[PDB]
Design a protein around this ligand. Structure first.
Ligand SMILES: [Cl-]
Ligand SMILES: [Cl-]
Lengths: 245, 245
């Protein structure tokens, strides 16, 4: 039976697009671009560092990704600037229905499994006012790998004492849905972009950069096992779990 | 001393853009989009499968990435169509100065180390008429991992019997440059996109797709160790090696 609901953090509980005003105010006219590449390279670097066996925590990864992104524009800000701007990732706005969702899941164990470094996650959750909505906020850091490495998901049992079969893993990220399924969790994917809308957007004329990100990041990955469930929003989760087992 | 020059294949010896006319058929008006997302997802899938510990050779990866890409456009091609169109990757055009480069690099050992599956590389190299330019064409398939996993590079000493220090690794891919430096090779990066041109391109009003691919794929990655050498083209390597020794 499902004894725990484990949440992916970035893109799932928290909007990664919500760094837009900071990236934009900091560099006018370049906000949307930076927001997309920052996230894309943040992911790529987590995968590439882990696959090289050269781990560094998500805070270092987040700042490396930012430096690369600003670099593409011809900017070379010092470490102090990068650390300050990177704080934006610790202030992501939670999705409007995250709190209500977590409230309705109170009977079950509630947790986060994230690539985020310990201090990042704490700040992130505390600033969202969701600290009291979780029995555990788990960082992959202890394992010194990143998703979808199996060791990242092994932490769930270690911390909560529940078996993979008793876990419902929630994520808006294809790669993370694939990792959790591979490891043996039941998965609910959060799909906020309808496939039919993307298809039409991709042919609505000249393809914008924001649509590029969506095309790379907001779909199920073809190499990955399909999720057990797909909901359009977090608020649908409580009800999904009700009529589940 | 440099006893062998080991080349990255895709993007380095072979133009991944040269699938343009094949994709422009799979969907007139969208060949450029497909070309770019296909290559991007092809790379992501190689990283994610390996990191997940669920290897499938580059031929499956190539097809899965193509299916994903076409799927974003709303198409649902069958296996036969995918396998047929994916052949475009075994017909990539070598860069105009590749042959000359390889010739002038003899009698030094010359080899390919590529993510490509064995039959892909053989067909790709044979179509380009470069079979007699290489002492060995090495696929990572033997290790059942993908770059930048260290085992990928370990094959080089196994096949050529040269130590990492005796290898000059050539690649246009920042993640491959990073993995080879990580492993211990000396590395010559082929940088066909000037940083200053990209920076300005990203500032010139609306940002095109190819530009998005370029921003994501044609730079040195910030987490990676820098390459020992950077040249503009393959033809510059023979001279690099000479002035090097
Ligand atoms: Cl993430
Ligand atoms: Cl490759």
């Amino acid at each position: 039976m499902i004894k725990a609901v484990v949440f992916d953090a970035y893109g799932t509980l928290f909007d990664v697009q919500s760094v837009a005003d900071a990236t934009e105010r900091a560099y006018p006219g370049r906000g949307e671009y930076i927001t997309q590449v920052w996230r894309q390279k943040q992911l790529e670097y987590s995968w590439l560092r882990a696959l090289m066996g050269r781990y560094a925590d998500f805070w270092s990864v987040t700042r490396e990704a930012l430096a690369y992104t600003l670099g593409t524009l011809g900017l070379e800000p010092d470490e102090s600037f990068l650390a300050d701007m990177a704080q934006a990732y610790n202030r992501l706005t939670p999705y409007p229905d995250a709190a209500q969702c977590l409230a309705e899941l109170a009977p079950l164990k509630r947790a986060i499994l994230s690539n985020g470094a310990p201090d990042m996650l704490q700040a992130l959750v505390a600033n969202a006012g969701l600290t009291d909505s979780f029995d555990a906020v788990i960082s992959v850091d202890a394992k010194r790998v990143f998703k979808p490495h199996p060791d990242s998901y092994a932490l769930v049992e270690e911390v909560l004492g529940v078996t993979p079969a008793e876990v419902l893993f929630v994520s808006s990220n294809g790669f993370d849905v694939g990792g959790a399924k591979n490891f043996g969790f039941s998965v609910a994917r959060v799909a906020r972009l309808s496939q039919e809308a993307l298809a039409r957007e991709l042919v609505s004329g000249t393809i914008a950069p924001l649509t590029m990100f969506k095309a790379l990041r907001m779909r199920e990955e073809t190499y990955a096992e399909a999720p057990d469930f797909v909901v359009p929003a977090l608020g649908d989760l409580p009800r999904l779990v009700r009529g589940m087992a």
